[PDB]
From a paper:
We characterize the binding of IAA to MarR-family regulators from both iac and iad loci. Most characterized MarR-family regulators function as repressors by binding to an operator sequence upstream of the genes they control. When a relevant ligand binds the MarR repressor, it releases from DNA, allowing gene expression. The structures of MarRs from representatives of each auxin degradation operon type establish that each has distinct IAA-binding pockets.
MarR proteins were produced from three iad and three iac loci and their binding affinities for IAA were measured. The strongest binding to IAA was observed for the IadR MarRs from iad loci, with MarR_3CDH from Ruegeria pomeroyi having the highest affinity (KD of 0.237 ± 0.099 µM). We also provide crystal structures of MarR regulators from P. putida, E. soli, Bradyrhizobium japonicum and A. baumannii.
Author numbering:
A (entry chain A): 9 to 97, 106 to 160
B (entry chain B): 12 to 98, 104 to 160
Write the structure that this text describes.
């Protein structure tokens, strides 16, 4: 888009920053609504998810991988320790209750993901993910 | 079951579009701050550059902000000379000065976009955008 901003609706439909912003907003709103039933929010869920994958992380790494501000991540990790989902091993990990909670919330999350990908070929999903992953490599400030 | 491994997380589109949107928006706000602009004003200019007129609530959808934030920023943009109120409700239109400002500051965002798409082929950009646009159609609550 060297010569100028996207100018028509058809051009906007090809402008990836608009698309990932509109998507992230609606996905996160819907997810936060569903998570409210469990008394947690997106940041807590994303923290459970990345601790499930990595087992232990520092609070700084949680902030990066769960995509939240460092100050918000430290306060939320303390909240999650108080509520028995995370333990302090500055590295933290899941408690059994934290893993159980992730497991119990995943059916609804999987249903939301199924709706997200309706009408999209698996090969196109793979190309889209490869593109977005390289974009993350291009602009991330933290190399994790 | 949730993404369980690092490789799975690296291919998980909701993680990717959240991490991307966060860093892109933070960078954009930082780079625009020197020009007295924020994310919402810039994205409002950007979508009125396409549509010319929109209601405030439509601006909130397409510029991806809260309705209340959009209303306050639109009023600021009236004082900035960048939009004008029109006569169904809360209609605003881009002024020639608003168009000129967007064209003037665009090279900053074009630079950021060039960084974003480094190492990504045009055909893969096209596939990525088509996937994300269908995802928007699948989950959007507003039919704009």
């Amino acid at each position: 888009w060297k010569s100028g901003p996207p100018r028509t609706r058809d051009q906007l439909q090809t402008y990836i920053p608009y698309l990932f912003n509109r998507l992230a907003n609606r996905w996160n709103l819907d997810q936060n609504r569903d998570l409210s039933d469990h008394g947690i929010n997106n940041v807590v869920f994303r923290t459970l998810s990345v601790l499930f994958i990595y087992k232990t992380l520092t609070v700084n790494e949680v902030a990066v991988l769960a995509v939240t501000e460092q100050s918000t991540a430290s306060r939320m990790v303390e909240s999650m320790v108080s509520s028995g989902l995370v333990k302090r091993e500055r590295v933290v990990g899941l408690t059994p209750d934290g893993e159980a909670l992730l497991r119990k919330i995943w059916p609804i999350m999987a249903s939301n993901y199924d709706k997200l990908i309706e009408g999209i070929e698996p090969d196109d999903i793979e190309v889209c993910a490869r593109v977005l992953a390289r974009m993350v490599e291009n602009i991330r400030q933290n190399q994790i």
